[PDB]
């Protein structure tokens, strides 16, 4: 039950993958609040390139909207809509 | 469609997720070689917990074997098996 080479290469080469991302990364302006959940799942470019002088970066972006709980200290728990950026295609470019 | 609260939460709570991991970071000792591909897909703990004093951590691990191409500078390209650690179960625990 060893994973064969071309399978390994194909599954690791630069493409959009489901990545759990802290909401504060996307909304650093709203650092005073607490969010539930604190992490959200987003298609983002990752994996490797043929060379260690190339980076995996996106070429087509898009937005998705999710319901997130937001708590301000000495204030209420609100559930509300927040928008996040997703990556649809990726390319290997020089670093 | 707007993703519903309960669905966001279920998808992002502490669990094993396919993750692209740099082979250098798993074997810093073998820093002399070049790897192709240079990262691999592994089941690892990710996601968030109900609280900000808990970490997502593994409770059950195992090994998977993959065919990797190992290149030494001024030497040949050899494809051989390497072993990596996977997480099978995850739980939220204190830090």
């Amino acid at each position: 039950e060893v994973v064969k080479f071309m399978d390994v290469y194909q599954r690791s080469y630069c493409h959009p993958i489901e990545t759990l991302v802290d909401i504060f990364q996307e909304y650093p302006d709203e650092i005073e609040y607490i969010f539930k959940p604190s992490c959200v799942p987003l298609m983002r470019c990752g994996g490797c390139c043929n060379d260690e002088g190339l980076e995996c970066v996106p070429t087509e972006e898009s937005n998705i909207t999710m319901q997130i709980m937001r708590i301000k200290p000495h204030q209420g728990q609100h559930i509300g809509e927040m928008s996040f950026l997703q990556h649809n295609k990726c390319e290997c470019r020089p670093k | 469609e707007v993703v519903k609260f309960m669905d966001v939460y279920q998808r992002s709570y502490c669990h094993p997720i396919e993750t692209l991991v740099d082979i250098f970071q798993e074997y810093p000792d073998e820093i002399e070689y070049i790897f192709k591909p240079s990262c691999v897909p592994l089941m690892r703990c990710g996601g968030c917990c109900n609280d900000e004093g808990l970490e997502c951590v593994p409770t059950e691990e195992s090994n998977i074997t993959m065919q990797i191409m190992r290149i030494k500078p001024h030497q040949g390209q050899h494809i051989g098996e390497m072993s990596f650690l996977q997480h099978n179960k995850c739980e939220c625990r204190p830090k």
Binding site: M6, Y9, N50, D51, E91, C92, R93 | M69, Q77
Partner: peptide, 15 residues
């Protein structure tokens, strides 16, 4: 075998 794109077995000949 262009370094910027994905794959053919006969790229991996050359190694």
């Amino acid at each position: 075998c262009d370094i910027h794109v994905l794959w053919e077995w006969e790229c991996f000949x050359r190694x």
